[PDB]
Design a protein around this ligand. Structure first.
Ligand code: NA
Length: 264
């Protein structure tokens, strides 16, 4: 490898790759080695004492809230792509726990949904027995946290969906928002789905967001249940008019602030 400039940093063989250098680690290497093969999970090329595929298309919001023509039809292909990958991960007993939009990148500058990749597994954990051998939800405190952590991966896709639809985040108005104001909004379980831009959004889209962001995490939807919703299944039925959106930096800043509030 011929180590080049930082974006963690790019390299060569003769082809270009990315390298994520970490300070003193094992759970991420294991998830990437057993599941990296998935088209929409970043492929691990090598591990030394980690080499991955170089993402050349930037983060999701950067494309969808800028150049790319973006309507409900396009938003549906994004949720499906990511929803299917998350459904696959949950079936294998893998929870992500950092499924914020900045961890969803494009391999190329095409904006094609197939090019989407979930890129960071540093917060990800595998459901283990105790010995511990790997366990899936299929073979039934550890199981209760997994259920809670699955619902947190769905909630995160819920805020992604909301952002894609509204062109703003459900619980933060900008980077200036404090944990106090964001945490109060989350805890209330209330969010706008009416007025202005929301008035031209489909009733099916509003139905899914409500079900994904539901106050009661028990009345919330599973990854399998999201993908079976008409908004995802019935693509022909969706509006194809450009979705309105706020300034990109403002939206990105609102997301960073939201996750900063949650991680605290
Ligand atoms: Na892959």
């Amino acid at each position: 490898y011929v180590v080049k400039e930082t974006i963690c940093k790019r390299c060569v063989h003769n082809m270009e790759y990315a390298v994520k250098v970490i300070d003193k680690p094992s759970e991420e290497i294991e998830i990437l080695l057993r599941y990296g093969q998935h088209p929409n999970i970043i492929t691990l090329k090598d591990v030394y004492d980690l080499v991955t595929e170089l993402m050349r298309g930037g983060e999701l919001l950067d494309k969808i809230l800028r150049q790319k023509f973006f309507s409900e039809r396009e938003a549906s292909f994004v949720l499906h792509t990511i929803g299917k990958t998350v459904e696959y991960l949950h079936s294998q007993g893998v929870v992500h726990r950092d499924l914020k939009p900045s961890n969803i990148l494009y391999v190329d500058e095409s904006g094609n949904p197939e090019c989407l990749r979930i890129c960071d597994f540093g917060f990800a954990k595998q459901l283990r027995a105790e010995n511990g051998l790997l366990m899936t939800p299929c073979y039934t405190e550890v199981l209760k946290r997994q259920g809670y952590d699955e619902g947190c991966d769905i909630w995160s896709l819920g805020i992604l969906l909301y952002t894609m639809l509204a062109g703003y985040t459900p619980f933060a108005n900008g980077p200036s928002d404090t944990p106090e104001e964001i945490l109060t909004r989350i805890g209330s379980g209330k969010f706008t789905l009416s007025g202005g831009n929301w008035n031209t959004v489909s009733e099916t889209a509003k139905d899914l967001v409500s079900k994904m962001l539901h106050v009661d995490p028990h009345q919330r939807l599973t990854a399998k249940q999201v993908l079976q919703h008409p908004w995802v299944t019935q693509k022909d039925k969706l509006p194809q008019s450009q979705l309105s959106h706020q300034d990109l930096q403002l939206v990105k800043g609102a997301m960073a602030a939201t996750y900063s509030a949650l991680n605290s």
